[PDB]
């Protein structure tokens, strides 16, 4: 009766872990000041490495500088050693971060580097590096403490399975977070036992991006393939399957400029948030071979927004209850 096992799934970078943090923030132990600090060395590591990619992108994509003076700033950054002990762990000390801030601020205001970021759809880069590069000010202070939103926007690749417990609406939730990458999926099968519900996350923002395992496969294309295998698994015939179309904030601003035909050559519709988003949702629910028996509970979320996550999760719990304790 009151024992619930939930599985967070989806392809890589869809927002799964961002969700856990939201859960911890709204239900479990919300992040203490000291907890947030732990996210500092990683935030500085998203910034510096994100930039490393931009500067490499500029030279590779052949984007003329906006100031040739910043070429000496570019070297300083390429010099950064990423295989060192702490940097390998995806961490960067304040002492050293502050040693690059000057070159980062300059390279960030450069026009050439900006045009590179605008063409990011051609190389692996987390669009959360932009949120930090615009806040270099609050980050350049002595003792900087990540805010509640900074933690959520922080990035860290997840490998393996991560279990979590918490009580909400008198139900004992056993929430598991996994890694989405292809090599990470084999580890999934160790959790297909007695699943009460599955929340398959998808990122609307990458219908124009490629996988990082093979820079030649549409992310959104993999998400659909991955969903068709889960949603139709004999292990989940009696499991409530919730689908989260995440990153609606980034998509709503994405369609306007880059087209959606980059993913659906047959999409004859318009580049509207309402019309395109409604198109994608059908792209998925259609993969359902058991449209009669199996039901999919779709939702448009924004994992980084707490209020939205709290609203949507409350609607997800009411579904789990009606489908079991009836």
């Amino acid at each position: 009766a009151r024992e619930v096992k939930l599985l967070l799934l989806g392809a890589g970078e869809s927002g799964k872990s961002t969700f856990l943090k939201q859960m911890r923030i709204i239900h479990g132990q919300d992040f203490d000041q000291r907890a947030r600090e732990e996210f500092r060395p990683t935030i500085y590591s998203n910034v510096i490495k994100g930039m490393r990619v931009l500067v490499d992108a500029r030279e590779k994509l052949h984007i003329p500088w906006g100031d040739n003076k910043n070429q000496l700033h570019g070297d300083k950054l390429m010099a950064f050693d990423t295989r060192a002990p702490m940097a390998a762990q995806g961490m960067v000390e304040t002492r050293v971060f502050l040693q690059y801030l000057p070159a980062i601020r300059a390279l960030w205001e450069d026009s050439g580097i900006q045009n590179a970021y605008d063409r990011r759809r051609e190389f692996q880069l987390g669009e959360s590096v932009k949120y930090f590069l615009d806040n270099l000010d609050k980050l350049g202070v002595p003792d900087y403490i990540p805010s509640q939103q900074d933690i959520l926007l922080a990035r860290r690749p997840t490998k393996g399975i991560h279990e979590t417990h918490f009580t909400f609406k008198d139900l004992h939730f056993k929430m598991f977070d996994v890694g989405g990458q292809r090599s990470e999926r084999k580890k999934w099968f160790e959790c297909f036992e007695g699943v009460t519900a599955i929340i398959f996350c998808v990122a609307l923002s990458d219908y124009d991006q490629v996988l990082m395992e093979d820079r030649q496969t549409n992310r959104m294309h993999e998400s659909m393939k991955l969903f068709d295998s889960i949603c139709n698994n004999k292990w989940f015939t009696d499991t409530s399957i919730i689908l989260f179309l995440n990153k609606k904030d980034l998509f709503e601003e994405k369609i306007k400029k880059s087209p959606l035909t980059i993913c659906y050559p047959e999409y004859a519709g318009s580049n509207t948030y309402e019309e395109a988003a409604a198109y994608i949702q059908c792209q998925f629910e259609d993969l359902n071979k058991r449209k009669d028996t199996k039901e999919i509970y779709t939702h448009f979320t924004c994992a980084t927004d707490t209020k939205n996550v709290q609203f949507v999760f409350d609607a997800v719990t009411d579904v789990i209850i009606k489908n079991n304790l009836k």
Partner: protein, 196 residues
Amino acid sequence: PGLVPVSIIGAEDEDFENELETSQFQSLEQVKRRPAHLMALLQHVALQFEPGPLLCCLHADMLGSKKAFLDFYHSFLEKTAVLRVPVPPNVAFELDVQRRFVQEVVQSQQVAVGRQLEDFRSKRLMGMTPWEQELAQLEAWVGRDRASYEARERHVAERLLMHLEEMQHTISTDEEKSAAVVNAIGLYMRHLGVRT
């Protein structure tokens, strides 16, 4: 199959350095010899599709040196058999020459066996298949000793065959269809060298 280097550096590429760089299930005639690999396929099918066609093919081709046709007709072709398989309207009516009949049942299961091997392949790549670990670990094996390899395959098959036995409450609601399958799979595995 051929690799290629990345153009632009990805921030989290070193985090997956040894995970990158990825035809074992092209035909049944190929995997029917590999006990371990077959247990990976045998699971996928038994669990997701109908074990009929696949098992039939295995028990069929098992023939090659009598009484086998006796139990065969009682588990697959029997109008009331548990693991009934879709047979041609031709032989259905017609029920040494045994050769033509068996051969005529297999060919009708080609489209099904072929279509499930492909489904397995598809899942394989996406990483949505079980036992990939043991499967892969059984691939990166070097040695001037051939017969020794086959040796460990048998033990792996045993591990999987048991793991698939103890926990099989997913084949189908039918508490008996599962007994037939495990048994069928059991018998064939014994033909390779798997202890039961």
